[PDB]
Design a protein around this motif. Structure first.
Motif, PDB file in Angstrom:
ATOM      1  N   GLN A 139      58.381  57.013  14.641  1.00 22.58           N
ATOM      2  CA  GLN A 139      58.539  55.819  13.800  1.00 22.58           C
ATOM      3  C   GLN A 139      59.361  56.191  12.576  1.00 22.58           C
ATOM      4  N   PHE A 140      59.151  57.417  12.109  1.00 18.70           N
ATOM      5  CA  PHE A 140      59.847  57.953  10.953  1.00 18.70           C
ATOM      6  C   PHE A 140      61.327  58.104  11.288  1.00 18.70           C
ATOM      7  N   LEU A 141      61.618  58.533  12.514  1.00 24.61           N
ATOM      8  CA  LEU A 141      63.002  58.700  12.948  1.00 24.61           C
ATOM      9  C   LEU A 141      63.651  57.330  13.022  1.00 24.61           C
ATOM     10  N   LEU A 142      62.901  56.371  13.559  1.00 18.52           N
ATOM     11  CA  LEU A 142      63.363  54.994  13.680  1.00 18.52           C
ATOM     12  C   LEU A 142      63.651  54.441  12.283  1.00 18.52           C
ATOM     13  N   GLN A 143      62.862  54.851  11.304  1.00 22.36           N
ATOM     14  CA  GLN A 143      63.066  54.385   9.941  1.00 22.36           C
ATOM     15  C   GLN A 143      64.386  54.903   9.359  1.00 22.36           C
ATOM     16  N   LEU A 144      64.662  56.191   9.552  1.00 23.33           N
ATOM     17  CA  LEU A 144      65.900  56.803   9.055  1.00 23.33           C
ATOM     18  C   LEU A 144      67.104  56.185   9.748  1.00 23.33           C
ATOM     19  N   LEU A 145      66.941  55.908  11.036  1.00 22.23           N
ATOM     20  CA  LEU A 145      68.000  55.321  11.840  1.00 22.23           C
ATOM     21  C   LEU A 145      68.323  53.865  11.426  1.00 22.23           C
ATOM     22  N   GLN A 146      67.472  53.262  10.605  1.00 24.64           N
ATOM     23  CA  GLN A 146      67.682  51.883  10.165  1.00 24.64           C
ATOM     24  C   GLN A 146      68.496  51.799   8.861  1.00 24.64           C
ATOM     25  N   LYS A 147      68.539  52.896   8.115  1.00 21.29           N
ATOM     26  CA  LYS A 147      69.250  52.923   6.847  1.00 21.29           C
ATOM     27  C   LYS A 147      70.553  53.723   6.878  1.00 21.29           C
ATOM     28  N   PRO A 148      71.675  53.073   6.516  1.00 15.21           N
ATOM     29  CA  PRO A 148      73.000  53.707   6.496  1.00 15.21           C
ATOM     30  C   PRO A 148      73.011  54.974   5.659  1.00 15.21           C
ATOM     31  N   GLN A 149      72.173  54.997   4.631  1.00 15.39           N
ATOM     32  CA  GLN A 149      72.081  56.138   3.738  1.00 15.39           C
ATOM     33  C   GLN A 149      71.765  57.438   4.468  1.00 15.39           C
ATOM     34  N   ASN A 150      71.148  57.334   5.643  1.00 17.61           N
ATOM     35  CA  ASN A 150      70.771  58.521   6.414  1.00 17.61           C
ATOM     36  C   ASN A 150      71.630  58.783   7.633  1.00 17.61           C
ATOM     37  N   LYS A 151      72.702  58.008   7.785  1.00 16.76           N
ATOM     38  CA  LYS A 151      73.602  58.165   8.923  1.00 16.76           C
ATOM     39  C   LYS A 151      74.202  59.570   8.960  1.00 16.76           C
ATOM     40  N   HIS A 152      74.385  60.175   7.792  1.00 16.55           N
ATOM     41  CA  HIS A 152      74.952  61.519   7.740  1.00 16.55           C
ATOM     42  C   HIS A 152      73.996  62.579   8.277  1.00 16.55           C
TER      43      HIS A 152
END
Ligand code: ZN
Ligand code: ZN
Length: 93
Positions: free
Chosen positions: A9-22
């Motif tokens: 779920q945490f991975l899914l959360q990061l994958l939802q925000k452009p800020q973490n695309k890097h």
DNA sequence: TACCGGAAGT
DNA sequence: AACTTCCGGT
């Protein structure tokens, strides 16, 4: 008093925000993603769960446990690439 | 260094 | 249960 958040779920959360695309990005339109910055994602996970010694070694072991559960599988022969078995089915329980 | 699953700790 | 921490073998 940590987050009850699950790792997938945490991975899914990061994958939802452009800020973490890097550090983590989708590599397909059917659930495939890649940990561009694997150790950075691991440190973020450790902060969330309060495990200061968290690293990609141990995070990957947790991902490997998902193989059996059929939540996430490894994309063979592609470093840091994984795939959500059934994305987005896992979001409409 | 990445990836893998067994075994034991939390 | 869902990881977390180690380990040794591919
Ligand atoms: Zn559905
Ligand atoms: Zn080792």
């Amino acid at each position: 008093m940590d987050s009850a958040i699950t790792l997938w779920q945490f991975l899914l959360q990061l994958l939802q925000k452009p800020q973490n695309k890097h550090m983590i990005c989708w590599t397909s339109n059917d659930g495939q993603f890649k940990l561009l910055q694997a150790e950075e994602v691991a440190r973020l996970w450790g902060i969330r769960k309060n495990k200061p010694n968290m690293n990609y070694d141990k995070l990957s072991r947790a991902l490997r446990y998902y193989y059996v559960k059929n939540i996430i599988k490894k994309v063979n022969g592609q470093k840091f690439v994984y795939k959500f078995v059934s994305y987005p089915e896992i979001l409409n329980m």
